[PDB]
Design a protein around this ligand. Structure first.
Ligand SMILES: *[C@@H]1O[C@H](CO)[C@@H](O)[C@H](O)[C@H]1NC(C)=O
Lengths: 437, 53
């Protein structure tokens, strides 16, 4: 039996979904949403890590002939110097002067903990999101697991459910992101091609297989001082360590809807946005028929105290003549006020207590027993002076009812002030009809 | 890897306003954000006792 419904995407909020098919007793569904999780697509442009400047021991040779050779390792500084007079512990070696060679070379290589201490870049796109939904009805109460994509079944049991697609994907992520040990950032990066010497990503290596470690870290060599053996190389500090040092402003604190990020598959969980449509079909034998416990007769409602707006302050009394006592269904058609009690047992006396809540001081919620329906109104004037630490359990719609009890005098004074000018128009019309002649 | 745990901040809620007293033993960090569409983030290091509204 197909039927459609909508659920606000608010975690921890029980939802009541009423099915009122004829030929059977009307029935109610308890809906729970537990920890949604939006998972994006990842592209893995390149990688960034520390760099080690590998320099071999300098080459000394006292003949004067230079040997300049070029290899394929990154950012060589191929240079050899003359006029060197090196010194060591034993004073000095050799005798010749003004005719000597001093070969100095250095290059760069990836870090030793590159396997573990790396930082990853990723590209985001249209993202799917999974949700865990708990369904309950008469003597059946189970959790589910659905991808809540455009179309997909659940098959919790006798019935079957299909959760519709999200209205809009307001993903906190966007385009390019960085993942590094349990936190992400909405910080853009230079492309894999070229990078600035020092800011960030001065090493733009690809996947961890250590191939073509592109470097633009700008090594520079210089003439060693005349004192002893040297290898003077100038280098800017690693941008990876500096970026870690500055860090700051983690994205986990910038979620526009308080959506906590977990990094193992990189997903965002426990955040409210939009609403989720759903469709369902139910077998005929999943509930009772109309012949069981029809005991509505007449109906009227009363309210004792209606201190509202925090969890539930609307205690209501419903009395009615009863047939053989038994179970039944109860809900409210409108959404200005919401109840918590599911299908409740009915005694022969007929006195039934209900708990509901609302926002406006003049609710017009229309209660509905599994066969009857009567308008219920209350003067829920008194608020309460607190700042609650728990969750709200009603719709945010606050609006005094059209009928109401405190705003009636506004309506009557407006109607009377309109009536003055309406009667003035009437008397003018009669006068002008007299004088038109 | 063990890490310290600061004392519970002293909260004294007003109306549509939240007042808190902070008694730090070492320089720590306090951040807050709003569940609404505009988050309005905030972060600021703390080293001495201070009140924040
Ligand atoms: C469903 O069962 C769980 C026990 O696992 C219980 O805590 C929960 O209240 C039940 N649902 C309802 C609507 O009673």
């Amino acid at each position: 039996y197909e039927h459609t419904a909508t659920i606000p995407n608010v975690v921890g909020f029980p939802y009541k979904a009423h099915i009122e098919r004829n030929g059977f007793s009307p029935m109610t569904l308890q809906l729970e949403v537990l920890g949604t999780s939006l998972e994006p697509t990842l592209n893995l442009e390149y990688i960034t890590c520390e760099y080690k400047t590998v320099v071999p021991s300098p080459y000394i040779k006292c003949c004067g002939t230079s040997e300049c050779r070029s290899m394929e390792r990154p950012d060589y500084q191929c240079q050899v110097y003359t006029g060197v007079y090196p010194f060591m512990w034993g004073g000095a070696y050799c005798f010749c002067d003004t005719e000597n060679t001093q070969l100095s070379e250095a290059y760069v290589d990836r870090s030793d903990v590159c396997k573990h201490d790396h930082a990853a870049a990723y590209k985001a796109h249209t993202a799917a999101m999974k949700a865990t939904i708990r369904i309950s009805y008469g003597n059946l109460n189970q959790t589910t697991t659905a991808f809540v994509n455009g179309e997909h079944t659940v098959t919790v049991g006798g019935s079957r459910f299909t959760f519709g697609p999200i209205s809009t994907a307001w993903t906190p992520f966007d385009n390019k992101i960085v993942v590094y040990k349990n936190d992400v950032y909405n910080l853009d990066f230079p492309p894999y091609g070229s990078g600035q010497p020092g800011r960030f990503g001065d090493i733009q290596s690809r996947t961890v297989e250590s191939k073509d470690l592109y470097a633009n870290t700008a090594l520079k060599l210089s003439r060693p001082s005349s004192g002893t053996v040297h290898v003077p190389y100038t280098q800017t500090p690693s941008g990876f360590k500096y970026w870690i040092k500055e860090r700051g402003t983690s994205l986990n604190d910038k979620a526009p809807f308080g959506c906590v990020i977990k990094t193992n598959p990189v997903r965002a969980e426990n955040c409210a946005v939009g609403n989720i449509p759903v469709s369902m079909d139910i077998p005929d034998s999943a509930f009772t028929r109309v012949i069981d416990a029809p005991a509505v007769t007449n109906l009227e409602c009363q309210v004792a105290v209606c201190t509202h707006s925090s969890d539930f302050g609307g205690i209501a009394t419903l009395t009615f003549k009863t047939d053989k006592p038994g179970k039944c269904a109860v809900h409210s058609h409108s959404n200005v006020a919401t109840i918590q009690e599911a299908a409740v047992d009915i005694k022969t006396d007929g006195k039934i207590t209900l708990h509901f809540s609302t926002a406006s001081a003049s609710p017009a919620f229309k209660v509905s027993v599994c066969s009857a329906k009567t308008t219920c109104m209350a003067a829920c004037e008194p608020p309460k002076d607190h700042i609650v630490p728990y969750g709200a359990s009603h719709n945010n719609q606050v609006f005094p009812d059209m009928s109401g009890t405190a705003m009636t005098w506004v309506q009557r004074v407006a109607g009377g002030f309109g009536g003055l000018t309406l009667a003035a128009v009437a008397v003018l019309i009669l006068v002008t009809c007299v004088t038109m002649r | 890897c063990r890490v310290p745990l600061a004392r519970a901040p002293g909260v004294t809620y007003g109306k549509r306003e939240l007042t808190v007293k902070l008694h730090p033993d070492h320089p720590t960090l306090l951040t807050y954000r709003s569940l609404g569409a505009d988050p309005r983030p905030y972060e600021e290091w703390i080293d001495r006792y201070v009140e924040r509204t």
